[PDB]
Assembly symmetry: D2
Homo-oligomer: 294 residues x 4
């Protein structure tokens, strides 16, 4: 449980101008999260450009993140794939790496059934001893892992939680009532995450935490302590970021914000991500200023 | 133009019981399409389980399909990827293969902007002499290539057409009016394909054509000749298949139907596709019987 | 024949007090007679059916009939979300001179397919007037499906449908369930030409309020299979087709009517409010695109 | 305080002719008094507002007030899609004894945020009675957004909202724009407990028609922060929360009322039709799950 709760950053993969991982920038981010009280780092999720790294660069970024973390902050590896054999293969690369767990997205594009999702995640879970956090994000995947199937999978010993990114807050108690008390419920939607914690959620895997780590850590700890009015004060400060970090496709805005705050050298991404527009720059700058970060 | 019109089959990748390509079954399918008057074969699209073949098996199936075709029927290679560098790499593998063109899906999962889609397809187009057919399917990808961006891309010399799979028939004339007369408009939605041709579409890339090739060839030729009442007679025969081939995730139903008609040895798929349910079997059998195929 | 081509969903022109302005309605009806409009729908959605009581509703229909003076057929809006009120409103127009009724699926109370069947069947049985069913789920919360249209088409004086989903798959789904003389009309200007090209017989049009000559020409060209020529007209009308909804209908089309000199006042009843500055600029650019300004 | 907890959207019980059945309404109101229901909404959606004319509407509200006899507060449904009709209906209840009005966003005519503002502001200015705004886009075609709720909350007798989207992000979006005594009520039974846990003050409930004791207990436990205990009740009510909509509301809840002996007849007005065999079996299994049968 506890390690997989609070503010978990869906960390950018900072790049040089050629699109290659920038170690010095990642080191700065990881020292930042250690200092800020971030609970854990998700390495090569969606915000980390999993889509545009091959499995070798993917593995390199995860092992680099672990190495820079140096035991100071838990690392969760993104291990999602839309082929079950590939998800198992990617998961096996990190067995005994030192990561504490895996974040495994529902297959994207091929739109499996609820039985396909069950057989997919069960097969992955049987090929590792690592804790598995299911990841539901239908806007990106074209499929919806429903609470009934979550309940089914929760019975598998090392399936320990879900990163629910629908923004549909009815999912919190629909899942909670089909699962044991130590099954972890994490928001994957920054704008609705405090609401998600107020309904019983245990934390959030956050893009906003990339640039407001100390605020996001404080908001999740206040939510866990049941101080929701104090948590809402931080959430109101952060809400323009929660929204405007998606004004253009994630992670285009958050990489620009990281660069503007001096957290990374370069806001470079890989195609088909393209540089932030003038209009997006002014929108994200107004949001950083609203959060008191600029 | 003409080669990229009429009934184009989105061909299954027939597998043995281990999930490996079955050459004897693919040979039977390809001789079937030659005999039936199918215009062309799309090799390793969505129906061909692109999602669960690695790029090496992908390349093998395409080269196998070309080899079995033996010049008798044009082959279009599925070349889609959600990373631009990977789309270019996959496209380069088929340069000078003998395929006549590429079917290239909008990046899935990473949800690029209209400018990201432009820069993605333009970069691919600049790395080949092969004709490129854009593929829009938001239900699977999480993004929507809009007519405005299609018009932009149509100006690139070897971007020659789109496989519009929204089922939104307003797209036909929205695209047609932004593009030249020889820009190819193909339905990617069997249930709405005749409607799509009646509005100006030039053909369809079809799952139904896998099991009703001669009917689908005849329906597209009648539509092209402007005999829509005669085309609707075939479409009414086929409509339960057009729908029920999606009763469970494609290609689970069409692989079962292919096996039941004796067109392939095995209906085996790769996870996260799972075997057809009892209920799906009886639904697809009733649909085959309605089309007069059983 | 009378239920095909360009049918205007005519505005109820108002004075500044929100009362029907006969002189403006006379000018609109003369304009439709001169432009080749096939028929007038009186007090549909575009006619502010929502904000007229049944007495003002009946008066506007009787005024429209009187002004038409046999020169152009009049179809009455007769919709209601209570079946007893639909019958009662329908019974007011029996022997009025209207050629038919446009009857929307009940809004707000979200009936079943069986409730829609019983609703339209009851209405049809209380009149000899032809009935055109009207599907517009975006306004009603309710979707009359092709299967239920097929069921209703068997009732003698249920003669057609205004299909306002903008879902063009409904044309051949309905057409294959109904007789060859069941009339298919678009209720969606932006997709109407597409609708006719798939086999629709006409449109009940907001755009035809201000581009009646172009809308009559486009529907006639489509009916004769001159689609290339019909697409040229649709391209010059497409900004109106879209921007007449840039604010709630009929706020833009009433402003356009006034701007072209077709009506004295762009006045509406609450909860419709005056067109915004941004709206005026959008609608003026669309009128200019159509060659009307 | 009076606008919090479990508020029943009460059925208008009918005889077989479709007329209000006073003896059945008396038994429902005695039942709500005995069960701890906080208040009655009279002639809302569940009360078939759509199929009663304004005279029958007023009679049902006056009958409900009379039967309540000061034992339980009565809130009148006063919604209309024409602002002049909303004012007129509201003016009928001034000095009636109702404690407040529930006024739905105009349905069918799809006004702007500015039109909704002018609609509710005009209504509020023609009464001293508290106004509860009612957002239900699935029925209306119209979505009253938090920003517009904030604007309206500044008008003295606009005191709260029934938020029936089932979108739980609206609770804190509205709450941060309005004063601490602006009342937030769920209009969606299946998500009501969630709504209260995010800071909502109560629910206007279909389920409370047949599980009034459980619904009062769940809202009171939620208000006191006994969520574990409130979730146990929600779990035994969840099949009713969902299956009372298995057919159009109020077809299932009227059948459930009759089956429990709370009303004489499950009769409705067209276009509502009798519950299907499949519906009866679904609703009976849900009543049994709730321990009511
Ligand atoms: Na990144
Ligand atoms: Na971002
Ligand atoms: Na396949
Ligand atoms: Na299939
Ligand atoms: Na009007
Ligand atoms: Na006309
Ligand atoms: Na309705
Ligand atoms: Na249409
Ligand atoms: Na308008
Ligand atoms: Na009722
Ligand atoms: Na109660
Ligand atoms: Na509305
Ligand atoms: Na709710
Ligand atoms: Na009900």
């Amino acid at each position: 449980h506890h390690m997989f709760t609070g503010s978990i950053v869906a960390i950018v993969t900072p790049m040089d101008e050629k699109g290659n991982v920038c170690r010095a920038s990642l080191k700065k981010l990881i020292d930042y999260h250690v200092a800020s009280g971030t609970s854990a780092i998700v390495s090569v999720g969606t915000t980390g450009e999993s889509a545009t790294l091959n499995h070798d660069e993917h593995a390199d970024v995860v092992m680099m993140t672990l190495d820079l973390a140096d035991g100071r902050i838990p690392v969760i590896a993104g291990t999602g794939a839309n082929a079950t054999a590939e998800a198992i293969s990617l998961t096996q690369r990190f067995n005994d790496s030192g990561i504490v767990g895996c974040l495994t997205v529902t297959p994207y594009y091929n739109r499996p059934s609820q039985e396909g999702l069950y057989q997919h995640f069960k097969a992955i879970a049987e090929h590792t001893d690592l804790p598995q956090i299911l990841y539901n994000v239908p806007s990106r995947t074209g499929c919806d892992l429903l609470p009934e199937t979550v309940g089914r999978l929760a019975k598998v010993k090392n399936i320990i939680g879900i990163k629910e990114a629908t923004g549909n807050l009815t999912r919190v108690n629909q899942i909670k009532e089909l699962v044991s008390d130590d099954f972890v419920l994490l928001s994957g939607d920054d704008a609705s995450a405090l609401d998600f914690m107020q309904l019983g959620g245990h934390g959030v895997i956050s893009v906003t935490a990339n640039v407001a780590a100390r605020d996001m850590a404080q908001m999740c700890k206040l939510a866990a302590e049941g101080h929701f009015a104090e948590a809402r004060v931080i959430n109101q400060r952060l809400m323009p970021l929660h929204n405007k970090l998606f004004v253009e496709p994630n992670p285009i805005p958050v990489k620009w914000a990281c660069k503007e705050l001096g957290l990374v050298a370069t806001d470079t991404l890989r195609l088909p991500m393209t540089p932030i527009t003038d209009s997006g720059r002014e929108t994200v700058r107004a949001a950083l200023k609203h959060a008191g970060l600029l």
